[PDB]
Symmetry: D2
Subunit: 252 residues, 4 copies
């Protein structure tokens, strides 16, 4: 419900159809596929995003969190690694040489996200279980400045299930980084949120076209339900075979 | 795409951008990063596979992108500004091989069609690199993963990165997100950005301007470059530009 | 008993050092990187597991190290210079776990003896972090992998990294060479470097000075920081200092 | 150097190593990382500047190193193992240019003597790359900064990296410690490691075996590769091998 959103949703679907035909003819929008040794990462489902009243609050939590709980419940039944990020700063004074906001402060209100405040805590409804990692990050993607890639590479993870907020911010930069670094991104659609119109729709479409597969939470839970116990999983060593299109030859 | 779809899409997207801009501004997003004092220009994939027709990566609109890229190059070269070019090409395109360089991007887009050293891999002749400009062969969307770009930028104290090229919903956006994260101010000259399906340039330049960099006109970029001292004399801005600060909400208990 | 091994090894290592230095000088290695203009100080792992006796990682010589480290801190905080501290600690020491953060360094050194938030993990009281100084919990030898150190150094345009701490044969060397590679001039104050077995401090400092940073006295570093402007007014040297250049050997064909 | 020093040096260094190993042993260091199941080989700078006499980077001992590198290569090529080669060369060697790729390493070693595409940049003929093998041009000591090596190793799930090459006191050590940090088990065939001044090979291989990788004989490495399944069929070891765990000390208060 909203004045614009019904029309925006309807016309964005038409634009999406059009684009999918061009993409499909050219051989884009291929399926990356689920791998065998997954990790789950919840991007910034901390109070500043899940609770109302912060500059970073996202609506839709009433639908995101139950779906996040279904995934957590499936994953921790197999001992799958679960990571959470909270985007917070220890030194919010942009004139100091030890400030950790860098240039993102020149774009978004980083000074409103103090480390170890209520706003920095992962939301109670999905509190971290024992052995799950909470990573405090300083930039949008969960990779820069954190140790997420040291866990994922050292422990041979091949699939990264990404959930969280926002589609137009931290989720997309994380997914883009993951496929480039070497991890298969699966995005469970109902767990992604944002705070302005259209951005969830068009960012998930862009992600599904070139960076990760956007799936239903039901698909993701069913996949985790069919997993062996994590300690017995082995990664897929190369990409899944694709219907290859042929490289055009030099015109001269 | 039928013109009724194009027409109605521009209209609803404008409604969405108006609405979104108000929310962002109210909350303190969409601030201006601003030009720094010691820039580099990088042209993302304005190589024949994107600029010429007949390849699966071909982007339309080059007729508008190329003369504007040239305006930037002319202003930059005049000042001795570093200009980098990238081309997204692969030395070993067999997904079954242990030294294939396509990795998992082959499971999403047709990377097998981009051979290194072919016609398609060369930079477009209309904007041919000048002596001393760097051409980087890259394997992933952003210009940073697996390349030496960040070594140039950090070791030579570059504070601003003018990003041009293709595509808005692919390589240009991931390069901009990486650059601001790493510490370089991204300025996107709006007219030098291309793509190949409806809506994507508009909504991706909207998202970039809101959280990752300042979308500007090529006119503004050229005026900035024209006002620079010679690159030899530029020194970088050492911290962020001061911002209108939003106050952190106090904890309810 | 008594075996004069320390003095015997120092005398013959000095003979090796004279020989190597002649070769390096002739070939044009061992050049001075020189101090830049906008410095940061990083103290590597001077936490209780290294500075206090009783832990598998304890280093002797802290009585010489800590006062020199304190001299640099006192000189740095007088100028508003950024000071960073690392502590190498782990939050999940169960190598069977998928969320263990020790990776493969557990197959070489006893990582499971370093718990985060224990006494052992705490920076030594004699050099307690002052307000605004950063404590980085790291998981690998160099202070860069898996941390946000590079984000501070690149975003705040730092050009010089003064490195102190433990050990010459572990964490200090890998940090120093990662620093010059990424673009930060490493200066090592000799007297603040420690280790726990013979020879390693000497030969690792020699190797660093030859190809990766300048090994100086703490006196020179304190004097550099004392002659510095306030940090807010410093700006980085934009390129390398000119070197006496050696000519490339001509190709046979 | 003086041969009397070479022999004195070898003998006294053995005393220092013996003593050091006793201490590492009483602390639980120097554990074995072990061979994994899915390896790649990397030859660090066995290019003409290092292998052939007459360059400032020339190394002695190639008559021993190269037959041993050839044995590894023959074994690897039989199983289809990925073999990578690096060469350390520069496209723009003018330190005052904003697009020079030498960075600050030029302020330490003579990087201006290493042109890309020169005779000196070529991989030595005796160990010439076979088709499918990758030659990586790199700009800094470790083979990881500014290159796509990590893209190959992570995307293709390599767990072990066999490192050969020049020098022990430079590019080989930085590459090995980067590798264990990133998540790849480093194996060093002792006979294939070279350098140009006294003692460095000995003390750098000691330091590496203590904390960063396993120094093995070439026979050991060849036996491993000969026992391997065909590369296409190998799967990586997903976590560390179990280690003899040392007791984490309790906090004194």
């Amino acid at each position: 419900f909203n004045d614009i959103e019904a029309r925006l949703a309807a016309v964005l679907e038409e634009a999406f159809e059009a684009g999918t035909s061009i993409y499909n003819e050219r051989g884009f929008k291929r399926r990356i596929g689920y791998g065998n040794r997954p990790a789950v990462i919840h991007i910034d489902l901390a109070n500043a995003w899940t609770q109302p009243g912060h500059p970073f609050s996202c609506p839709g939590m009433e639908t995101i969190i139950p779906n996040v709980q279904r995934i957590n419940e499936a994953a921790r039944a197999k001992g799958v690694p679960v990571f959470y990020t909270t985007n917070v700063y220890r030194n919010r004074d942009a004139s100091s040489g030890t400030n950790d906001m860098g240039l993102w402060y020149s774009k978004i209100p980083t000074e409103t996200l103090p480390a170890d405040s209520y706003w920095a805590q992962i939301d109670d409804r999905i509190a971290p279980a024992d052995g799950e990692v909470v990573i405090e990050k300083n930039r949008a993607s969960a990779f820069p400045g954190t140790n997420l890639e040291l866990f994922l590479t050292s422990n041979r993870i091949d699939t990264l299930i990404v959930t969280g907020a926002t589609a137009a911010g931290c989720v997309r930069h994380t997914v883009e980084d993951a496929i480039a670094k070497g991890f298969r991104p699966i995005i469970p659609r109902e767990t992604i949120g944002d705070r302005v119109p259209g951005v969830v729709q068009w960012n998930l479409y862009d992600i599904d076209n070139k960076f990760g597969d956007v799936e239903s939470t039901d698909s993701v839970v069913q996949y985790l339900d069919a997993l062996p116990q994590f300690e017995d999983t082995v990664p897929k060593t190369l990409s899944d075979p694709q219907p290859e299109v042929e490289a055009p030859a030099d015109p001269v």
